[PDB]
Design a protein around this nucleic acid. Structure first.
Lengths: 974, 410, 399
DNA sequence: AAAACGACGGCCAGTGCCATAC
DNA sequence: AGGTATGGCACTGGCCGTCGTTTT
């Protein structure tokens, strides 16, 4: 129908007919009048409508009575062979472990009676797998052990068994472990603990075409069942507020504690000397039997844990969509070429030059400061007066002649004199003393001559060392900085009698009198702490972005750069040096923290014979290029909300000017003849919260004011969320953005009253408290109806607290249980905000799983030639052969529609607003980008992507352009 | 102000030479001053050796070249400058001595046609070697020729000669790579200049277009009165090579990958005497400034001309002298430059010596005493810190070799 | 013949087979040297600088310019820096065409610049200023290496690079210092020779009567002059500084005296050619002395997996350059030649050693070594080769 | 001439703060 | 009652080792 009650535009005629039944139901007249009067009291009952163009499609055939039956049948078909293989591991009868581990290269299978037999491959449907890596040698796999339903297995690297002067440092699949079989049901399942690291060492996993293989992780199933909050983690470690009943049913993620909880028995033993992380290959050769024993031990403990966990997981998350989602999340794939090496080199060089420029400037100040030692002049400097100004004694043990004649004699004379005096070394102490005649503070800044990384001068200095701001003589509003051990960085205000050691009351008074010449108390803000007891001065804290109770850990942090340009924070050495140091710090902060992780990514390069013919027979192919991939080490469930976690790629920064490393993602580059297709969910979590509020109130889309505003605010009228917030009380729309996002996460009056004070300095604290009171009454209302009700958002909060208070909280759409460690039995009213946020975050995870299931279905159904690339919580990407690139965009749009409709169906609403039905655009691109047009110039690639590499910009297509590109059909015939 | 105090120091410590009148800004910039004093000669030699290290030593496919100082043979008419004419050859209009009158201008054609010229640039003589040296690398097209030498420039009671020391790279590139190599060498040389600088922000570049519209770059140093040009880069293309060698282009082809092309010339040319002056201004010149009046030249350890000062304390003269001679011969045999201060009878106090050595930019003062004959310990003062340390004589050589060898990696 | 033909083939010389002639090389108007010649000359120059200047506390470098300005002394047939522009400048009006064709000769002889003929005069122009650096202690020296310009024979330019020392002394000891410098310079020329009897000295006398010495090398066609020593006395200092002599005095014997001037000057291009002939003395090889030879070692690659062998060769090449050893990177050529030609090429270039990297290096690290002097072949482990080379160079230098 | 001990510098785990992502 | 994760550097205290001074 073109409209529903309250005259919101709804899903197209033919689409609603195809997706839903014609039967339906009426909301009821009372529900309608309950909604209309509510919209009347808020002022929303006046229509800004602008009707969207209608759209019609012949959808692929659904299955069963309704969309939930369809999604169940889809997920059951995808999962069945792997759950079949997994059941074989619940009833295996494992032989005794073999008495002596075999030495040979490759794979060996062991019989009973311990007889080692050479076999090319394990040839098994299900395995538990573990790989060991010598960290000194690099990234090559070193040895591994596997168990099947019937045999033990072990593997040796050729680099362990042989001895050679050198091996190639570029990796090839010929140096990875072979695992999957030549061209039984044979849809292999591999299980492990942190299994993605073991996956990274499998040779066949790098081929560009797909594989049947799939992976299951004991750590992720632990995270689903009884995984702990990050705060609960630190509490649990401290125990090894008042409920304390949850501790007996929960643990940390390490294999030992997981075995202890699920299995019990005698504790697991580590090797104490840690040869794989700290030894060398000689030690591996010598300790061989003991290491392979410890590997079999961990393998067996993993097998024992798996048998216990699986029935609990199958109970607490019964819907097949969850398992299919988890199983598809385990197969990400990032393509790369030879430009990766150049990117790494250029980044390292640019970082080094900028850091050298900064170090030179600090080292000159450090050098020159040494001259204050003479005459004890440092006692008068309002900085540095409190450093270690001490010298350490050196320690013992207890005419007009002609040309010459016989010059060779004077030569040997002097040489022998020198050798004689050189030999007195026997009287020196054995430990060489370190710079005893330099001052102690300067002494600390210099390496030792024994260090292989020694350089001249005080080359250990940094901006983030506490000495550095004393050298630059940093000043705030005219006052010198000071560091308080309790309170962190602040500044000293002179002028106080009554003391409220030679610097006091003298030099700082003069310096500020000079500043006042150039332009109770006389100053305010983080007011005087009498706990710090410098004579003459008062001490004030520096303000922090998070308010007074945080401590400032360095004045060079981003948040102070505005106050430098404003001229509130100033340096002594003059107006150029301060802001330039802050600039450089901003430029390099990201690369400082990530360069080890980024540069040690494991890359495998694919030889000629491995590539697709659609690559090699292509106009854009080059010889002497390189092609390869990186396999991200994602843990499929790393959080209480069951989100993915990865050390690198999920925290990679987006391309930004003035940030040295930012083009990281743009180095992921489709090979000739392939393309990246994907999209990003629009305003996902606001929509989820709104539609939950609608389903709780009256069963109509837009029945609550927050729902309407989410659907019908078009920014031009004063009627979006932020305009309305800024209308209830006088703030800008940009501040209201902040208050709104804070309130959604469960902020209250302390948060809002703080931000109020922090945005209008004229406000009294009482005014802030009253305006916060009014803002919260307006938004969420009053806490009970007698002596939440009456807010634009009250019913959404009511619904979320309803779910979170249930005896067994379950996610409203898909019914996964929350962790046992947070059920109200084990936890009365602690951790409440985490429990409330979990409802939305886990709903978004179900949304992700549904999208993955749908895309896998449509790709296998229309024989589309493409692959899942990666996801980042609310984005998905697919690698596609260029011929199908326009069909992929239609499959994505259909997946979006089916996901949106499925979500509403489980809430008991039989319709969808037309505005949310599709992605605003689909991106077609050769590299990963936040936006299709970005050229990604950075200080490390100032000429940009289009000139260094020739990668063009791409296309961003709405549904209609996809129709006119496809005629609305996924068939290969078009 | 500051600039004249700097020039007072530079003459008194024999970096420059000649009177105040000969050392004004115009004379120094033009290159018609009397010459550099011995410390300036050593500073320039160090700078040239750092340049040779960075450009040629590690660069597997660059080679040295030697263009002559003059151009022989017949020359194009109408270029204005001086030529190697003589009063002996003047007689070719004097066959009859009674010839005269304003008819003489015919003789301009004679002096233009058959008199030599002093070279003005290093590129042309390098291009004369392209055909011959392309054999060295089996025609593999990325290769270069480099040299260092003096150039002569006309400047303006009528005329004077400017002499300038210049360093040049000529780099041959397949035409598609030309902008890539331009950007590469621009970054390389700008970082090379910044590497030794104490305030590398005073070095800068800008993009330029020639009058014909070919791309290039210029590098500037910000002297206290304004920017001055110190180096230039041009993509010249192929035209000059074609003009040098008319006819069958088959001689000119090199090998690019598997295909045969004619290269673009890239030309890089820098001024070393201005470089020296720029580093001199760089090395010199808020209570940490207001009350550290100390005068010192903070020249980089790779560049500073004199590294060690040797002195003696009071005591048995023959013993101290023999041990100082041993030290001096040891240090010089391992390539460390030393000032024999122990040979000037010690009129000054230690404060005066330190002041003198700080003006000379000397890195380390070594002092020998009576106590050294017993325990073998010597005193060492740092220029950068003014702090004194004790060190055993057996290790001094290796310490100094470490300090200088690692100064490259600071 | 054969020696020069080889030196043209192997880029010691430059130009073409028509321009290649011995008389032109002697006169200094040949086309120029190749890169190997440049390196060889730089080696000679650095060994001269270390032998003369480094170990002397009282010999200082000097910076004479390449030309002399101002008015000359007339009657000299020599180069002038004069321009046709200035021929239009002198004609400030047309009517100066009076007696002009003879008179302009005397004018260009009066007002023009001159090219540098020798380094002596530039050193003498600095004496009074450099005396301050020695606190006026009389015996001291100035040294410089630089190109000088000589009229040849329609004359042309000879360019010669020359090594010059000017030694100031009390006149009491001049002949002793002369004999000392003769001894040192002759033994310096003899050290690197393979047949030091081919270096010789003679006494000679000036037309005035002043005493001097001359050094020769016995080329196959005859002796050629290479270096000259003259005790010049004091005339030139007085002529260059008329008037109050008390500025000329330095300290001898605790008393003021005018120094005597000794001049030492050698031609380094002659020295280059002399050693080229000396080294050449059925095999052919240039047995240049290890301190002088321009390129020490060549790196090559044998049969096998090229991309793996190249990266280890790269590592070795960088290891050798970091320690100051010059390397010919033959491993870029894919060893397209037979090994006979490769050895003959390296023997003509005077390379000291050749290193072949082969599969077995990747197995066990053993490399083949050949020595140019012995033609013997041995295996050695890659780890130690650098210290073997440093040892061999030091054990050449200390003999 | 083996044995006792005291002071000091080196090594690591733990706490605090800032920087990335959605 | 602002949510969930990753990771870096700077700094502090506690502990074992060994080399030099006071000793059987």
């Amino acid at each position: 129908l073109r409209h529903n009650p309250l005259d919101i535009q709804m899903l197209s005629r033919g689409l609603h007919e195809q997706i839903f039944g014609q039967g339906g139901e009426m909301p009821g007249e009372a529900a309608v009048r309950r909604s209309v009067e509510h919209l009347q009291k808020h002022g929303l009952w006046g229509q800004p409508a602008v009707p969207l163009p209608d759209v019609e499609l012949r959808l692929p055939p659904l299955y069963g009575d309704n969309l939930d039956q369809h999604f169940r049948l889809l997920a059951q078909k995808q999962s069945l062979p792997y759950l079949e293989a997994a059941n074989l591991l619940l009833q295996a009868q494992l032989p005794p472990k073999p008495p002596a581990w075999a030495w040979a290269e490759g794979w060996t299978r062991y019989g009973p009676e311990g007889e080692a037999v050479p076999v090319a491959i394990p040839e098994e449907r299900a395995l538990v797998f573990d790989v060991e890596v010598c960290l000194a040698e690099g990234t090559c796999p070193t040895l591994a052990v596997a168990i099947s339903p019937s045999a033990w297995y072990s593997w040796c690297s050729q680099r362990l068994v042989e001895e050679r002067y050198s091996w190639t440092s570029q990796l090839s699949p010929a140096d990875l472990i072979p695992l999957e079989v030549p061209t039984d049901w044979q849809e292999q399942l591999v299980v492990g603990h942190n299994v993605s690291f073991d996956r990274a060492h499998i040779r066949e996993q790098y081929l560009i075409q797909g594989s049947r293989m799939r992976f299951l992780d004991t750590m992720s199933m632990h995270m689903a069942i009884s995984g702990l909050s990050s705060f609960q983690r630190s509490l649990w470690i401290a125990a090894k507020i008042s409920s304390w009943d949850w501790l007996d049913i929960s643990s940390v993620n390490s294999l030992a504690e997981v075995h202890r909880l699920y299995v019990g028995g005698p504790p697991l033993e580590k090797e104490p000397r840690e040869l794989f992380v700290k030894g060398t290959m000689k030690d591996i050769r010598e300790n061989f039997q003991d290491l392979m024993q410890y590997c079999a031990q961990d393998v067996w403990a993993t097998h024992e844990v798996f048998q216990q966990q699986l029935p609990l997981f199958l109970e607490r998350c019964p819907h097949p969509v969850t398992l299919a989602g988890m199983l598809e999340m385990g197969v990400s794939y990032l393509p790369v070429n030879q430009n990766w090496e150049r990117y790494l080199a250029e980044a390292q060089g640019t970082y080094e030059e900028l850091q050298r420029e900064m170090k030179k400037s600090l080292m000159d100040l450090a050098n020159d400061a040494c001259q204050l030692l003479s005459g004890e002049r440092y006692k008068e400097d309002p900085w540095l007066w409190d450093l270690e100004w001490d010298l350490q004694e050196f320690k013992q043990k207890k005419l007009g002649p002609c040309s010459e004649e016989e010059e060779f004699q004077q030569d040997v004379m002097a040489r022998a004199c020198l050798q004689k005096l050189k030999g007195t070394t026997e009287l020196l102490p054995k430990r060489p003393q370190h710079l005893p005649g330099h001052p102690g503070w300067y002494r600390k800044l210099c390496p030792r001559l024994d260090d292989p990384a020694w350089t001249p001068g005080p080359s250990l200095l940094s901006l983030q060392m506490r000495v550095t701001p004393k050298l630059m003589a940093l000043t705030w509003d005219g006052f010198p900085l000071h560091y308080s051990e309790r309170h962190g960085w602040g500044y000293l205000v002179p002028g106080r009698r009554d003391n409220l050691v030679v610097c006091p009351y003298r030099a700082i008074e003069s310096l500020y009198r000079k500043h006042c010449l150039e332009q109770p108390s006389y100053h305010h803000g983080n007011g005087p702490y009498n706990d710090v007891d410098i004579p003459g001065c008062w001490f004030f804290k520096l303000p922090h972005k998070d308010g007074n109770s945080c401590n400032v850990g360095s004045p060079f942090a981003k948040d102070f750069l505005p106050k430098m340009e404003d001229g509130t924070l100033q340096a002594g050495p003059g107006g150029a040096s301060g802001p330039r140091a802050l600039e450089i710090n901003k430029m390099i902060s990201f690369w400082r923290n990530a360069h080890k992780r980024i540069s040690s990514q494991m890359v495998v390069w694919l030889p000629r014979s491995a590539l697709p013919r659609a690559v090699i027979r292509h106009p854009d192919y080059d010889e002497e290029g390189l092609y390869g991939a990186i396999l991200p080490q994602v843990v499929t469930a790393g959080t209480i909300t069951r989100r993915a976690v990865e050390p690198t790629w999920l925290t990679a920064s987006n391309a930004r000017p003035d940030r040295v490393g930012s083009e990281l993602k743009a180095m992921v580059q489709a090979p000739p003849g392939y393309t990246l297709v994907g999209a990003d969910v629009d305003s996902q979590e606001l929509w989820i919260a709104a539609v939950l509020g609608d389903a709780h109130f009256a069963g109509m889309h837009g029945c609550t004011a927050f729902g309407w505003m989410t659907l019908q605010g078009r920014k031009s009228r004063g009627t979006d969320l932020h305009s309305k917030t800024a209308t209830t009380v006088g703030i800008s729309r940009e501040h209201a953005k902040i208050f709104n996002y804070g309130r959604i996460y469960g902020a209250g009056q302390p948060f809002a009253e703080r931000l109020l004070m922090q945005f209008n300095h004229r406000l009294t604290q009482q005014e802030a408290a009253e305006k916060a009171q009014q803002m919260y009454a307006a938004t969420k209302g009053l806490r009970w109806y007698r002596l939440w009700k009456g807010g634009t958002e009250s019913e959404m909060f009511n619904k979320l607290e309803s779910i979170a208070t249930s005896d067994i909280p379950r996610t409203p759409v898909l019914g996964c249980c929350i962790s046992r460690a947070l059920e109200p039995s084990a936890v009365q009213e602690e951790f409440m905000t985490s429990r409330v946020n979990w409802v939305v975050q886990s709903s978004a995870v179900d949304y992700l799983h549904l999208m993955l299931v749908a895309m896998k279905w449509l790709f296998e159904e229309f024989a589309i030639d493409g692959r899942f690339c990666i996801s980042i919580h609310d984005e998905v990407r697919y690698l596609v052969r260029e011929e199908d690139r326009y069909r992929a965009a239609l499959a994505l749009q259909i997946t979006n529609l089916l996901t949106r409709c499925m979500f509403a169906y489980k809430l008991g609403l039989n319709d969808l607003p037309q505005s949310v039905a599709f992605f605003s655009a689909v991106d077609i691109d050769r590299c990963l980008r936040k936006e299709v047009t970005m050229d990604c110039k950075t200080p490390s690639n100032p000429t940009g992507m289009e000139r260094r590499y020739g990668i063009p910009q791409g296309e961003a297509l709405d549904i209609y352009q996809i129709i006119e590109l496809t005629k609305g059909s996924l068939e290969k015939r078009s | 102000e500051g600039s004249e105090a700097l020039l007072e120091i530079c003459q008194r410590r024999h970096f420059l030479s000649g009177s105040k009148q000969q050392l004004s800004r115009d004379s120094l910039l033009s290159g018609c001053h009397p010459g550099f004093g011995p410390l300036g000669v050593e500073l320039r030699k160090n700078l040239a050796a750092e340049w040779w290290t960075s450009v040629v030593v590690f660069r597997e496919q660059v080679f040295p070249v030697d263009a002559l100082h003059h151009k022989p043979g017949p020359l194009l008419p109408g270029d204005s400058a001086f030529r190697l004419v003589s009063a002996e050859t003047l007689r070719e209009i004097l066959q009859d001595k009674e010839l005269s009158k304003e008819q003489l201008v015919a003789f301009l054609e004679n002096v233009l046609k058959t008199s030599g010229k002093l070279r003005e640039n290093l590129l042309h003589g390098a291009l004369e070697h392209y055909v011959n040296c392309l054999d060295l690398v089996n025609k593999r097209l990325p290769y270069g020729l480099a040299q260092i030498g003096v150039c002569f420039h006309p400047v303006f009671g009528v005329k004077s000669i400017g002499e300038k020391t210049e360093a040049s790279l000529v780099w041959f590139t397949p035409p598609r790579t030309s902008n890539q190599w331009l950007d590469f060498w621009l970054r390389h040389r700008l970082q090379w200049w910044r590497k030794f600088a104490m305030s590398p922000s005073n070095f800068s570049s800008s993009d330029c277009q020639d009058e014909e519209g070919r791309k290039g770059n210029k590098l500037y140093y910000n002297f206290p009165w304004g920017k001055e040009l110190i180096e230039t880069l041009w993509n010249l293309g192929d035209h000059e090579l074609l003009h040098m060698y008319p006819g069958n282009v088959s001689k000119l082809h090199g090998r690019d990958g598997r295909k045969n092309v004619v290269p673009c010339v890239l030309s890089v040319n820098g001024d070393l005497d201005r470089g020296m002056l720029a580093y001199l201004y760089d090395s010199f010149q808020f209570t940490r400034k207001k009350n550290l009046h100390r005068k010192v030249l903070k020249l980089h350890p790779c560049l500073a001309p004199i590294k060690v000062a040797l002195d003696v304390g009071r005591g048995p003269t023959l013993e101290l002298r023999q041990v100082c001679q041993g030290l001096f011969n040891e240090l010089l045999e391992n390539g460390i430059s030393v000032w024999p201060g122990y040979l000037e009878t010690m009129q000054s106090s230690l404060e005066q010596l330190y002041s003198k050595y700080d003006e000379m930019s000397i890195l380390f003062t070594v002092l020998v005493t009576e106590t050294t004959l017993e325990n073998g310990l010597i005193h060492l003062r740092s220029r950068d810190t003014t702090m004194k340390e004790m060190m055993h004589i057996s290790k001094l050589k290796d310490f100094l070799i470490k300090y200088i060898s690692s100064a490259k990696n600071v």
